[PDB]
């Protein structure tokens, strides 16, 4: 019970999904980056006809075209406006197309005299409206009637006319000029196959498909780990290695034609003579020896090596057969793949149960925490050349690091790959079969020596097994795209030494190698996970940088990091330690933004002020000037108390005032009638009543700031006095100057200019984008009997 | 002085780097700095003085920003940029001449022309960038 | 002249900036310019002539692009870049020598060598970038 | 020698470009390089000067990284960067002085001071960037 409680406490800090195997599905459901196609041009503005008024305030007989936001939904408050623009940035990033084909959006131009087409239907509507307009220039009308698209199918190019606001044109032109599609040919697909599988003679790869020049593809973002999750992220790295281990288990082949379990069990029972001994555990000795255990051991070893997940050794010290098989395990598997405690325990059991007793040496008093392992001490303390040389190899058989095609790889000793070192192992333990065991009871001594010989006499089978395991490891490691970083994980994979005994004693001579389709599936899953990791890093970095540059000081990067971790599909975010979350936040903050996202953000940031000032429901501020100022004459309003700038007035930032809560200065100025300008996105009331202007209601909207100490309810009055007012006769029929003591800092809409809005959008006439490159490769494999290893000899030569 | 140098360096870099056919990645940061300078200078009125035979000159800034969405710069981009660069270079040259022909005894290291004094305000500090000369 | 200078400047920047261990962020724009130059020059046959004792040389450009998926440049990246840089430097030196030994009364300002005349076509204008000398 | 030059170049660029009010786009790559230098040099002890009257100086590097979140650099950013740059510039000057006063008959082209010998290790090669001088 206590062990369960402590392990639960430790596991609650690891964001690994408790049903380990389910991870596989979550790992295999990560699809390639969704390819986005644009259905219509991105537009924020539209032309709109608005009434205009003469200098005397009389409405004219014609409307004028102006640019107006298609969706006017900007909120009040500067912070709220910046949040709106961050949300717009997220929308643009999500809706950003990976490629465009303008021909799909092309529509018939009604007024064209030469069968013209335009992109998009909105452009057609705008062009028709301008064509039917009476104030349009004759030259513009004739141009609309004559402007033509140019389709060059031989060049695979299309140019279409379009009507776009400069901001809309900027966005659409960025989408057109910076498409993610690259040409796809058979050379690219061939180079996409891992370079070590193309050079493997056991796999025959052919290109039985023809790719047209119009074939396109999107390159996966296989940038190595920018967050260095292998360093100082213990729980996240534990989860990553666990998921990798599950995937590697899924792709590891299944052993065939194993030795009969009944025959091997009878042989081992006869050789060991366990019933004749006085061992308190007579039945438990040969338990766990079966084909299922052998397959489990094979899968566990290869998957742990591939995923670089630490393993723990589970063994019963009295079962010396488990220790004898563990000798082979330590011979082949690098000793740094096991948790230090387990390696020390297994090695000390082997030393104190087999090796030192064999040579009459005093049992080793190993001190935990010693920089030397028990085998490292035994190597110096044992003089026999066979056992000492085997111990030396076992001590020095750690993984070697090598970068292949830019990916870090943990590779084995060449003696492991060819299985030659097993001979040394045999040599060593053959010497152990000849030893005297000076003070050991002869029956127990005979049993140990006969078990040692049980493992020894399978020299050929164990050489074949070592070569097969190494070959499978190399082949499946060729399909790994992220660096194989070796770290000691929090939780280990428990490896029963009875399973090692099963593998050693039941492996036959049937070579099994990963199928070409299995290799391609493993490589595709690795590529998809790596690409998704990089894309989500890019998204998180972009959003964090945008929030910081937009000065969204109340935005919580914890939510961004949680979304990033969720989209990685392998993290249970409820179990991520807070310190690791904040470390992830910091490391994400330190990264630079991706070029495409950064450019889109630059566009939004430079056009923010123009987009905000185009809104009809927020003003940029309000000037309270307690002197009478003439209402300006504007075409859009008539008489309007509109301020073109805030020059000559002290400026109080309403966002800072709201955040601080100190209303001393604003209250003092309002009480003392000190002219000021309150700056900030503000909603305003459009009053068309001349009697309201005479009553001076615009000056009665600021005392609530003093009363409530709030600036969210501030709604200044914007007078719009023109002939449509029910009391414009007061302005028209009397000799006076309409004035007011307050002005609303707001801008005027930009007029629609055909010359400035007519663009030529250029794209490709057509192409086809492909996602599964490896589907273009016909992969076959030689007969398993004929499969060879890296040394051009057969993997299993016992035959 | 730092803001004046930043204006001059931005314009020199615009002349040297904004060339037909060049990748926008070659001028991305330069165009960002140029647009920052435009935004900072827009809406401001400057006057270079009449000391000596130097003429009184009035400068107004109402320039639009440069595009940032082309893969490679073209003739239209270069022409549009040049139209603004010429005016900015003229303004910078006139400010430099106005500052060169003035001296003070009490504080000779401080700016002397009213244009450079205006450019020494906080609002123009955004124009400041690389000071490598 | 602008394209030839741009080739020379790109090669000088590649020699100076593409060094072992340097962050890829230090060369991202430089790598993009270098790859654009490779793409533009790839598939073009040039000849530097035999005026005087200058030896006739033929230049073929079939080079792979430089990688862009590293955090820090390593030895492999530097070697791969350096081979191409050496070939391009040889080509640029020979083109410059060919142009230096030529003159004309009518259009002496215009290019005289066949190679520089070829580089003056529109299809090479993409190579053009910062002209700061 | 290349790592020492890279340190000096990074510090010169930091002094020139990390100025109040400048766009972060103007220093993004520079700030990345500066943070790389800080990470590489952190946790290392150096000793400079034990020849002649050159004083013995002990150098320890425990510095925080520079921020990457600002739109335009402000006073706080500049002050932190300036303190770090001051310490690093003093270190680089002392290392250069220590190297300049030493000579060898056998391997005179190799580093002589122990500081430059330490800087010639692989763990410092990440500091290397543009070698344009």
Asked whether the beta carbons of residue D69 and residue A549 sit closer than 8 angstroms, the reply is yes
Q: How far is CA D126 from the centre of its chain?
A: 12
Output the 3-class SS for A518-532.
Answer: HHHHHHHHHHHHHHH
CA dist., res. C37 & res. A206, Å (int): 33
Residue by residue, DSSP assigns A577-597 as -HHHHHHHHHHHHHSPPPHHH
Residues 6+ apart with CB under 8 A from A468: A507, A511, A512, A795, A796
Instruction: Tell the burial category of A197 from Cβ atoms under 10 Å away from its Cβ (0-12, 13-18, 19+).
Output: buried
- The two tokens of residue D112 are 């002589």
Please state whether beta strands B45-48 and A638-640 pair in parallel, antiparallel, or not at all (unpaired): unpaired
Number of Cα atoms under 13 Å in the Cβ half of residue A747: 15
| Angle formed by the axes of helices A516-549 and A578-590, nearest 10° | 80
Distance between first and last Cα of chain D: 12
Residues 6+ apart with CB under 8 A from A58: A722, A723
Residue A654 φ then ψ, to 5° = -70, -25
Residues 6+ apart with CB under 8 A from A176: A100, A102, A761, A762, A763
Neighbours of chain A (3+ CB pairs under 8 A): B, C, D
* Nearest Cα residue to D113 out of D47, D41, D33, D61: D47
Report the 10 Å Cβ neighbour count for A654.
Answer: 23
**Closest partner residue to C71 among A222, A226, A403, by Cβ?**
A226
Q: How far is CA C5 from the centre of its chain?
A: 8
* Nearest Cα residue to A386 out of A357, A350, A424: A424
Report the 10 Å Cβ neighbour count for B131.
Answer: 16
At A304 the three-state DSSP class reads: helix
Residues 6+ apart with CB under 8 A from A737: A630
Q: Strands, E, within D13-131: which ranges?
A: 45-48, 57-60
Q: Strands, E, within A30-94: which ranges?
A: 45-53, 59-69
- The two tokens of residue D71 are 């739109």
Please state whether beta strands A619-630 and A739-745 pair in parallel, antiparallel, or not at all (unpaired): antiparallel
Q: Which residue of D has its CA nearest to B40?
A: D21
Q: Give, for A760, the enclosing helix (H) or strand (E).
A: strand A758-763
At D121 the three-state DSSP class reads: coil
Long-range CB contacts (< 8 A, 24+ apart) of D99-102? D99/D4, D101/D51, D101/D52, D101/D54, D102/D51
Q: With an 8 Å Cβ cutoff, is B52 touching chain C?
A: no
Residues 6+ apart with CB under 8 A from A136: A130, A754
Burial A152-183 (b: 16+ CB within 10 A, else e): eeeeeebbbbbbbbbbbbbbbbbbbebbbbee
CA dist., res. B92 & res. A482, Å (int): 53
CA dist., res. A48 & res. D102, Å (int): 78
Asked whether the beta carbons of residue A406 and residue C25 sit closer than 8 angstroms, the reply is no
Q: Which residue of B has its CA nearest to C36?
A: B23
Contact of A396 with A454, CB cutoff 8 Å: no
* Nearest Cα residue to A615 out of A71, A78, A84, A164: A71
CA dist., res. D16 & res. B129, Å (int): 8
What are the residues facing A781 on neighbouring strands? A203
Total residues belonging to chain B: 133
Q: Is the omega angle on the peptide bond into residue A527 within 30 degrees of 0, that is, cis?
A: no
Check residue C126 and report its DSSP letter.
G
Asked whether the beta carbons of residue C20 and residue D129 sit closer than 8 angstroms, the reply is no
- R_g (Cα) of chain B, nearest Å: 16
Alpha-carbon distance D44 to nearest alpha carbon in chain B (angstroms): 30
What are the residues facing A621 on neighbouring strands? A679, A745
Q: Strands, E, within D43-114: which ranges?
A: 45-48, 57-60
Return the sign of the alpha-carbon dihedral for residues A308, A310, A316, A320.
positive
**Closest partner residue to C20 among D29, D33, D125, by Cβ?**
D125
CA dist., res. C70 & res. B102, Å (int): 54
Total residues belonging to chain D: 133
Q: How far is CA A476 from the centre of its chain?
A: 23
Long-range CB contacts (< 8 A, 24+ apart) of A726-730? A726/A688, A726/A689, A727/A689, A727/A690, A727/A691, A728/A57, A728/A690, A730/A690, A730/A691, A730/A694
* Nearest Cα residue to A469 out of A667, A697, A275, A248: A248
Distances in whole angstroms, Cα of residue A625 to Cα of each of A59, A628, A653, A700, A717: 29, 8, 16, 13, 14
Contact of A761 with A118, CB cutoff 8 Å: no
Q: Give, for D41, the enclosing helix (H) or strand (E).
A: helix D28-41
* Nearest Cα residue to A489 out of A2, A1, A11: A11
CA dist., res. A182 & res. A25, Å (int): 30
The C-alpha angle A29, A30, A35, rounded to 5 degrees, equals 120
Output the 3-class SS for A79-133.
Answer: HHHHHHHHHHHHHHHHHCCCECCHHHHCEECCCCCCCCEECCHHHHHHHHHHHHC
Interface test with B, best of C1, C121, C128, C132 (most B CBs within 10 A): C128
Please state whether beta strands A181-183 and A215-218 pair in parallel, antiparallel, or not at all (unpaired): antiparallel
Which residues of chain B make contact with C132, given a CB cutoff of 8 A? Answer: 13, 16-17
What are the residues facing A678 on neighbouring strands? A622, A652
- The two tokens of residue A79 are 């912070």
CA dist., res. A703 & res. A388, Å (int): 94
CA dist., res. A3 & res. A19, Å (int): 20
CA dist., res. A343 & res. A373, Å (int): 8
CA dist., res. A334 & res. A304, Å (int): 11
What are the residues facing A203 on neighbouring strands? A781
Contact of B101 with B51, CB cutoff 8 Å: yes
Alpha-carbon dihedral C119, C121, C126, C128, rounded to 10 degrees: 50
At B57 the three-state DSSP class reads: strand
Residues 6+ apart with CB under 8 A from A557: A544, A547, A585, A588, A589
CA dist., res. A700 & res. A717, Å (int): 9
Q: With an 8 Å Cβ cutoff, is C83 touching chain D?
A: no
- The two tokens of residue A307 are 């995923």
CA dist., res. A409 & res. A305, Å (int): 11
Q: Strands, E, within chain B: which ranges?
A: 45-48, 57-60
Distances in whole angstroms, Cα of residue A780 to Cα of each of A187, A189, A470, A515, A785: 19, 16, 21, 8, 15
- The two tokens of residue A720 are 């719009």
CA dist., res. A125 & res. A578, Å (int): 54
Total residues belonging to chain C: 133
Residue D58 φ then ψ, to 5° = -105, 130
CA dist., res. A479 & res. A481, Å (int): 6
Alpha-carbon distance B71 to nearest alpha carbon in chain C (angstroms): 10
Q: Locate tokens 């309270």: which residue?
A: A624
- The two tokens of residue A407 are 């990916």
Report the 10 Å Cβ neighbour count for A303.
Answer: 23
Q: Locate tokens 């493992």: which residue?
A: A455
At A651 the three-state DSSP class reads: strand
CA dist., res. A508 & res. A797, Å (int): 11
CA dist., res. A547 & res. A569, Å (int): 24
Please state whether beta strands A117-118 and A150-152 pair in parallel, antiparallel, or not at all (unpaired): unpaired
CA dist., res. A17 & res. A23, Å (int): 7
The C-alpha angle A462, A466, A468, rounded to 5 degrees, equals 115
Contact of B129 with B40, CB cutoff 8 Å: no
At A6 the three-state DSSP class reads: helix
Check residue A274 and report its DSSP letter.
G
Report the 10 Å Cβ neighbour count for A556.
Answer: 11
Residues 6+ apart with CB under 8 A from A234: A489, A490, A580
Long-range CB contacts (< 8 A, 24+ apart) of B100-109? B101/B51, B101/B52, B101/B54, B102/B51
Contact of D18 with D73, CB cutoff 8 Å: yes
What are the residues facing A157 on neighbouring strands? A152
Distances in whole angstroms, Cα of residue C81 to Cα of each of C4, C6, C38, C73: 19, 17, 11, 11
Distance between first and last Cα of chain A: 50
- The two tokens of residue A132 are 């039917």
Q: Locate tokens 């717009």: which residue?
A: A88
Contact of A216 with A99, CB cutoff 8 Å: yes
Return the sign of the alpha-carbon dihedral for residues A523, A524, A529, A535.
positive
**Closest partner residue to C21 among D32, D125, D130, by Cβ?**
D125
Please state whether beta strands A717-721 and A181-183 pair in parallel, antiparallel, or not at all (unpaired): unpaired
* Nearest Cα residue to A44 out of A191, A152, A227, A169: A169
What are the residues facing C123 on neighbouring strands? none
Residues 6+ apart with CB under 8 A from A109: A116, A117, A118, A124, A127, A144, A147, A161
Contact of A164 with A43, CB cutoff 8 Å: yes
Residue A546 φ then ψ, to 5° = -65, -45
Q: How far is CA A640 from the centre of its chain?
A: 52
Which residues of chain B make contact with C128, given a CB cutoff of 8 A? Answer: 19-22
Q: With an 8 Å Cβ cutoff, is B1 touching chain C?
A: no
Which residues of chain B make contact with D25, given a CB cutoff of 8 A? Answer: 28-29, 32-33
Which residues of chain D make contact with B36, given a CB cutoff of 8 A? Answer: 23
Check residue C69 and report its DSSP letter.
-
Asked whether the beta carbons of residue A224 and residue C25 sit closer than 8 angstroms, the reply is no
Check residue A404 and report its DSSP letter.
E
Q: With an 8 Å Cβ cutoff, is B32 touching chain C?
A: no
- The two tokens of residue D129 are 């960037």
Burial D1-35 (b: 16+ CB within 10 A, else e): ebbbbbbbbbbebbbebbbbbbbbbbbbbbbbbbb
CA dist., res. B47 & res. B118, Å (int): 10
CA dist., res. A505 & res. A493, Å (int): 22
* Nearest Cα residue to A15 out of A682, A562, A407: A562
Alpha-carbon distance D130 to nearest alpha carbon in chain C (angstroms): 4
Asked whether the beta carbons of residue D68 and residue A549 sit closer than 8 angstroms, the reply is no
Q: Where are the domains of chain A?
A: 1-799
Contact of C72 with C21, CB cutoff 8 Å: yes
Residue A60 φ then ψ, to 5° = -80, 170
Asked whether the beta carbons of residue A592 and residue D70 sit closer than 8 angstroms, the reply is no
What are the residues facing A640 on neighbouring strands? A632, A720
* Nearest Cα residue to A325 out of A345, A293, A306, A350: A350
* Nearest Cα residue to A774 out of A203, A249, A299: A203
Which residues of chain C make contact with D125, given a CB cutoff of 8 A? Answer: 20-21
CA dist., res. D20 & res. A300, Å (int): 58
CA dist., res. A663 & res. A678, Å (int): 13
CA dist., res. A61 & res. A316, Å (int): 100
Contact of A591 with A666, CB cutoff 8 Å: no
- The two tokens of residue C131 are 């002209």
CA dist., res. B69 & res. A468, Å (int): 55
Which residues of chain D make contact with C132, given a CB cutoff of 8 A? Answer: none
Number of Cα atoms under 13 Å in the Cβ half of residue C78: 16
Which residues of chain A make contact with C25, given a CB cutoff of 8 A? Answer: 592
Q: With an 8 Å Cβ cutoff, is C128 touching chain B?
A: yes
């Amino acid at each position: 019970h206590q062990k369960e409680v402590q392990y639960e406490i430790l596991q609650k800090t690891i964001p690994t999904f408790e049903p380990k195997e389910s991870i596989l599905k979550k790992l295999e459901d990560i699809k390639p980056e969704q390819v986005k196609k644009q259905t219509k041009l991105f537009r924020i503005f539209e032309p709109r006809q608005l009434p205009v008024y003469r200098a005397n305030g009389e409405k004219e007989l014609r409307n004028r075209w102006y640019w107006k936001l298609k969706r006017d939904t900007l909120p009040d408050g500067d912070y709220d406006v910046r949040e709106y623009f961050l949300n717009l940035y997220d929308q643009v990033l999500t809706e950003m197309p990976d490629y465009l084909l303008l021909k799909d959006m092309a529509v018939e131009n009604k007024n064209s005299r030469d069968a013209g087409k335009v992109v998009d239907s909105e452009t057609a509507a705008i062009c028709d409206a301008i064509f039917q307009d009476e104030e349009t220039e004759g030259v513009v009308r004739r141009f609309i009637a004559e402007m033509r698209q140019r389709v060059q199918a031989d060049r695979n190019v299309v140019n279409y006319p379009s009507i776009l606001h400069p901001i809309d044109h900027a966005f659409n032109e960025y989408f057109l000029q910076h498409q993610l599609v690259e040409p796809l040919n058979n050379d690219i697909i061939f180079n996409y196959i891992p370079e070590r599988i193309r050079n493997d003679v056991n796999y025959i790869l052919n290109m039985d498909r023809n790719l047209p020049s119009t074939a396109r593809y999107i390159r996966p973002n296989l940038l190595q780990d920018r967050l260095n999750l292998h360093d100082n992220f213990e729980s996240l790295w534990d989860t990553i290695t666990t998921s990798n281990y599950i995937l590697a288990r899924s792709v590891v082949p299944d052993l065939k034609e194993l030795v009969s379990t009944e025959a091997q069990i009878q042989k081992m029972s006869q050789d060991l003579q366990l019933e004749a001994l006085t061992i308190q555990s007579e039945t438990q000795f040969l338990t766990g020896i079966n084909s299922q255990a052998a397959n489990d051991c094979f899968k566990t070893l290869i998957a742990a090596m591939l995923s670089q997940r630490t393993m723990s050794l589970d063994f019963v010290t009295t079962n010396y057969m488990s220790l004898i098989s563990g000798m082979w395990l330590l011979t082949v598997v690098p000793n740094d793949m096991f948790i230090r405690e387990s390696l020390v325990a297994c090695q000390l059991a082997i030393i104190n149960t087999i090796i030192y007793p064999a040579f009459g040496m005093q049992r080793m008093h190993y001190r935990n925490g010693d920089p030397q392992t028990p085998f490292q001490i035994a190597e110096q303390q044992i003089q026999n050349f066979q056992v000492a040389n085997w111990l030396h190899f076992v001590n020095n058989n750690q993984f070697r690091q090598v970068v292949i095609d830019g990916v870090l790889n943990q590779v084995l000793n060449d003696n492991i790959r060819n299985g030659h070192v097993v001979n040394q192992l045999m040599e060593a333990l053959m010497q152990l079969s000849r030893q005297q065991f000076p003070t050991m009871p002869v029956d127990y001594k005979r049993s140990i020596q006969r078990g040692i010989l049980l493992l020894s006499n399978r020299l050929g089978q164990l050489v074949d097994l070592t070569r097969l395991l190494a070959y499978n490891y190399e082949t499946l490691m060729a399909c790994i795209t992220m660096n194989m970083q070796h770290v000691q994980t929090l939780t280990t994979e428990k490896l029963q030494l009875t399973s090692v005994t099963s593998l050693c004693m039941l492996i036959g001579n049937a070579t099994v190698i990963p199928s070409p389709q299995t290799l391609f599936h493993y490589y595709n899953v690795n590529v998809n996970f790596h690409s998704n990791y990089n894309e989500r890093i890019n998204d998180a970095v972009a959003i964090i940088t945008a929030a910081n540059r937009l000065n969204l000081y109340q935005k919580k990067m914890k939510s961004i990091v949680e979304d990033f971790l969720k989209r990685l599909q392998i993290f249970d975010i409820s179990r991520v330690p807070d310190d690791q979350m904040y470390r992830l936040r910091d490391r994400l903050r330190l990264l630079p933004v991706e070029i495409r996202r950064l450019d889109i953000f630059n566009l939004i940031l430079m056009n923010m002020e123009q987009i905000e000032r185009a809104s009809d429901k927020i003003a940029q501020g309000v000037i309270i000037a307690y002197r009478d100022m003439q209402l300006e004459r504007d075409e859009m309003y008539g008489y309007v108390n509109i301020a073109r700038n805030l020059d000559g007035f002290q400026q109080i930032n309403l966002e800072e005032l709201m955040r601080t809560g100190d209303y001393a200065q604003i209250t003092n100025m309002l009480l003392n009638n000190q002219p000021v300008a309150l700056v900030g996105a503000l909603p305003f009331i459009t009053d068309s009543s001349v009697i309201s202007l005479v009553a001076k209601l615009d000056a009665t909207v600021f005392a609530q700031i003093v009363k409530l100490r709030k600036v969210d309810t501030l709604k200044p009055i914007l007078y719009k006095i023109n002939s449509d007012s029910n009391d414009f006769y007061l302005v028209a029929n009397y000799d006076w100057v309409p004035t007011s003591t307050t002005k609303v800092y707001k801008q005027i809409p930009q007029q629609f200019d055909f010359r400035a809005s007519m663009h030529m959008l250029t794209s490709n006439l057509t192409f086809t984008v492909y996602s599964d490159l490896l589907a273009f490769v016909s992969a076959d494999t030689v007969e398993p009997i004929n499969a060879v290893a890296f040394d051009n000899m057969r993997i299993m030569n016992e035959l | 002085m730092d803001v004046l140098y930043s204006l001059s360096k931005t314009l020199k870099d615009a002349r040297d780097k904004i060339v037909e056919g060049t990748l926008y990645s070659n001028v991305s940061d330069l165009i960002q700095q140029f647009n920052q300078m435009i935004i900072t200078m827009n809406g401001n009125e400057f006057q270079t003085g009449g000391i000596g035979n130097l003429p009184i000159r009035n400068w107004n800034f109402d320039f639009g920003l440069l595009g940032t969405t082309l893969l490679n710069l073209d003739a239209n981009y270069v022409e549009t940029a040049r139209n603004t660069i010429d005016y900015f270079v003229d303004f910078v040259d006139n400010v430099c001449m106005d500052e060169m022909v003035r001296e003070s005894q009490r504080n000779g290291i401080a700016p002397q022309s009213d244009s450079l004094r205006k450019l020494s305000g906080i609002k123009f500090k955004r124009i400041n960038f690389d000071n490598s000369s």
